[PDB]
Amino acid sequence: VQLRESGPSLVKPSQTLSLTCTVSGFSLNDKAVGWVRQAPGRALEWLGSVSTGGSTTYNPGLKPRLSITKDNSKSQISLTVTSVTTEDSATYYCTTVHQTTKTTKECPEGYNWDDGCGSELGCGGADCCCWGGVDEYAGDLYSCCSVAHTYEWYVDAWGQGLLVTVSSASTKGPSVFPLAPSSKSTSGGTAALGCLVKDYFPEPVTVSWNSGALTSGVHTFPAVLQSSGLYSLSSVVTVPSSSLGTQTYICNVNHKPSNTKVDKKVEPKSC
Amino acid sequence: QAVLNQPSSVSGSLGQRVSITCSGSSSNVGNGYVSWYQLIPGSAPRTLIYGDTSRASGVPDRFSGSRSGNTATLTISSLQAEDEADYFCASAEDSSSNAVFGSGTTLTVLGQPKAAPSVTLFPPSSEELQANKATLVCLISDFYPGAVTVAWKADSSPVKAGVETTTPSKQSNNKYAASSYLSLTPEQWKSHRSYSCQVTHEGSTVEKTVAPTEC
């Protein structure tokens, strides 16, 4: 099953965060779809889920600000967190939850299984009958079988997640600059080259090379947060020094928060 | 903020066993049916164990889960570098709908081979100088353990400001990489004679230099 999150990467402080999840390859009217998030440096935090029909369920500590609706028509579930703060900046994952409450039949303490219960006890079955000794006053002690409840919960599939940042700062696309290889910056048969993705906001940014056709020796680094409030990162790929002139190398930068994609060809320096 | 109790950090050598505990109470782990999830940096969480002991599809047998009362345990045998991640347990709290997670356990796999950093210092590009900016990029890769210090020098003297350095992060080959930036004005870049990025790691210090006269 595919779980795709959609919504704003950026929400201003003390406003409402609206996220949508589009499920592809399942009906929305049985399988439970839930939301899990993780703030930076914090543990996974359960938010809520919607079950068959619309049995919504939230976290006791966040139900006042949380709201989850459901539209089987468009096969979409939505989440809403009101009056958000920096503590609500996190990756929000759409998930398919498997809720289930297994039931098991038992007798009270001291009672055992027996077939002595009368029909007036309304136990709903001959096997659902318990007996616990012979009381001196009441006589044969009859009682219906008690039903327990075993709670079952786990996450079957995880969406890729959508990173949300709570800030008053406005979105800014990236400026992509070449990190070109040089006659002195080589390492023998291999040469390092890359792209500098500078001054963007909010996170995240992803980078591929040659539209994914080139993956060996690629590493995109985590971003740095500058004093300006803008992020920057680099992506480097190791290539054969002898191919610099003939093979073309293009970094594919994706910054969904600003609906921007940049392809930058990295030319080899004459130096 | 109720969270199940997990050890902050655990360790184990390649090929050996490791155990990660998940202590809670009778309303959670006691009722049974605990689950485990793996979260590798840069990837969505992956479900490993559910129902205390059942493995999810595609999970290797070396991952196994158990439970003894109000404490569950994830055991990982034949450890390998790729197992380094954060591991969270979870369970329902007196309600098949509501769920609580654990504090999370970071696994450190010991005994991995060491490797020295490969440093490449890029001067500001022409494209950036045209925007009246000048950033020096120092990229560091293929080292282990993931611990380095970076120092910037201008004309054999230390840089007093303008530096930003990322924390080492794992590559696809399990070695660590890191990056450092020196933000300058086009004038400073042309004023000085050379700039250096110094990378210290396990007794060696690798220094890479650039100068605008080479450009």
Side-chain angles (χ1 to χ4, degrees):
Chain A
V1 68
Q2 296 295 358
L3 306 172
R4 296 180 300 274
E5 297 84 350
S6 72
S9 308
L10 188 67
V11 170
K12 294 197 182 282
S14 296
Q15 300 195 1
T16 289
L17 171 65
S18 303
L19 296 178
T20 297
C21 175
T22 294
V23 306
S24 299
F26 269 162
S27 189
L28 182 48
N29 203 59
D30 182 61
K31 191 60 189 265
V33 194
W35 295 92
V36 187
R37 71 176 182 181
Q38 182 181 49
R42 293 290 294 100
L44 298 175
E45 186 173 27
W46 169 257
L47 291 172
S49 54
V50 70
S51 88
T52 57
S55 201
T56 68
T57 58
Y58 305 100
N59 177 266
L62 294 173
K63 57 183 292 188
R65 308 196 296 113
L66 294 183
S67 163
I68 293 171
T69 76
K70 171 186 202 182
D71 183 74
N72 283 280
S73 161
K74 309 147 93 307
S75 306
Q76 284 170 15
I77 188 192
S78 73
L79 172 70
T80 292
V81 188
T82 63
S83 317
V84 300
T85 70
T86 59
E87 299 195 13
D88 299 308
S89 304
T91 301
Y92 288 80
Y93 298 99
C94 182
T95 68
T96 53
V97 173
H98 196 262
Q99 309 187 153
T100 300
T101 303
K102 181 182 176 184
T103 61
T104 60
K105 56 188 294 182
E106 297 179 353
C107 292
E109 179 176 325
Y111 292 83
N112 300 276
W113 304 97
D114 188 61
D115 64 342
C117 306
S119 301
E120 68 279 7
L121 286 75
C123 304
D127 57 327
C128 178
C129 171
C130 305
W131 174 86
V134 185
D135 183 65
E136 298 171 355
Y137 298 86
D140 293 320
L141 297 175
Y142 298 145
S143 176
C144 299
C145 71
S146 56
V147 177
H149 297 279
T150 307
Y151 310 91
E152 301 181 2
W153 177 94
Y154 63 109
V155 176
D156 174 70
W158 298 83
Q160 285 281 357
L162 187 59
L163 185 63
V164 182
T165 304
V166 181
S167 172
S168 64
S170 294
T171 313
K172 178 175 176 69
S175 290
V176 189
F177 303 99
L179 300 170
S182 177
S183 65
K184 304 197 227 184
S185 70
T186 52
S187 176
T190 52
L193 69 93
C195 283
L196 176 63
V197 192
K198 189 160 153 245
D199 296 337
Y200 65 89
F201 186 89
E203 289 198 301
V205 160
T206 63
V207 186
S208 68
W209 289 88
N210 292 2
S211 308
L214 177 67
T215 55
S216 299
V218 171
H219 183 78
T220 300
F221 293 86
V224 304
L225 179 50
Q226 308 169 278
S227 60
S228 61
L230 308 179
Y231 293 94
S232 296
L233 65 68
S234 301
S235 185
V236 63
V237 63
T238 296
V239 300
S241 307
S242 58
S243 74
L244 292 173
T246 69
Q247 181 69 51
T248 288
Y249 294 114
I250 298 169
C251 63
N252 326 106
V253 179
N254 190 13
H255 186 234
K256 296 179 181 174
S258 75
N259 298 336
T260 306
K261 299 186 186 189
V262 183
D263 295 326
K264 180 63 184 177
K265 187 177 180 177
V266 177
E267 295 288 4
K269 287 180 183 164
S270 304
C271 302
Chain B
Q1 298 290 275
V3 184
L4 297 135
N5 180 17
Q6 304 185 231
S8 176
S9 301
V10 301
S11 58
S13 295
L14 297 174
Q16 286 181 343
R17 200 180 300 267
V18 72
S19 297
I20 302 177
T21 55
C22 177
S23 300
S25 88
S26 53
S27 51
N28 283 326
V29 179
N31 296 338
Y33 212 91
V34 171
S35 58
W36 295 87
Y37 308 91
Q38 181 186 62
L39 211 175
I40 301 173
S43 294
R46 183 178 68 181
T47 306
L48 295 179
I49 301 301
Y50 71 95
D52 292 329
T53 67
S54 313
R55 302 175 182 82
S57 187
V59 173
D61 306 0
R62 66 215 192 78
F63 295 79
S64 62
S66 65
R67 185 183 59 81
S68 184
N70 298 335
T71 298
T73 294
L74 182 70
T75 297
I76 311 176
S77 62
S78 299
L79 292 167
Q80 58 188 31
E82 291 79 352
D83 298 331
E84 290 184 328
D86 281 1
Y87 294 87
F88 299 85
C89 60
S91 174
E93 197 165 345
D94 296 353
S95 57
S96 175
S97 60
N98 185 25
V100 56
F101 292 91
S103 52
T105 299
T106 306
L107 174 59
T108 302
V109 177
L110 299 174
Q112 305 184 46
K114 299 202 284 184
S118 166
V119 188
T120 295
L121 178 56
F122 291 98
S125 66
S126 303
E127 287 84 349
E128 191 183 16
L129 294 172
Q130 294 153 18
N132 209 63
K133 304 265 184 56
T135 308
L136 291 72
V137 184
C138 190
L139 300 182
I140 321 173
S141 64
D142 291 314
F143 58 97
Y144 185 92
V148 306
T149 52
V150 178
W152 288 86
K153 308 303 177 190
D155 293 331
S156 297
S157 301
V159 167
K160 303 184 293 181
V163 178
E164 296 294 350
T165 299
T166 56
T167 304
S169 55
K170 222 159 140 183
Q171 308 174 188
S172 63
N173 64 2
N174 300 291
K175 304 204 180 88
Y176 283 96
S179 64
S180 196
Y181 301 92
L182 175 57
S183 302
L184 304 174
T185 63
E187 288 72 11
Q188 293 168 349
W189 167 241
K190 298 294 294 186
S191 171
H192 298 70
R193 187 177 296 93
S194 71
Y195 291 84
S196 301
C197 174
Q198 302 177 346
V199 175
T200 306
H201 182 271
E202 297 283 320
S204 76
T205 299
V206 182
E207 177 176 356
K208 304 288 287 197
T209 296
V210 295
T213 61
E214 271 68 336
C215 297

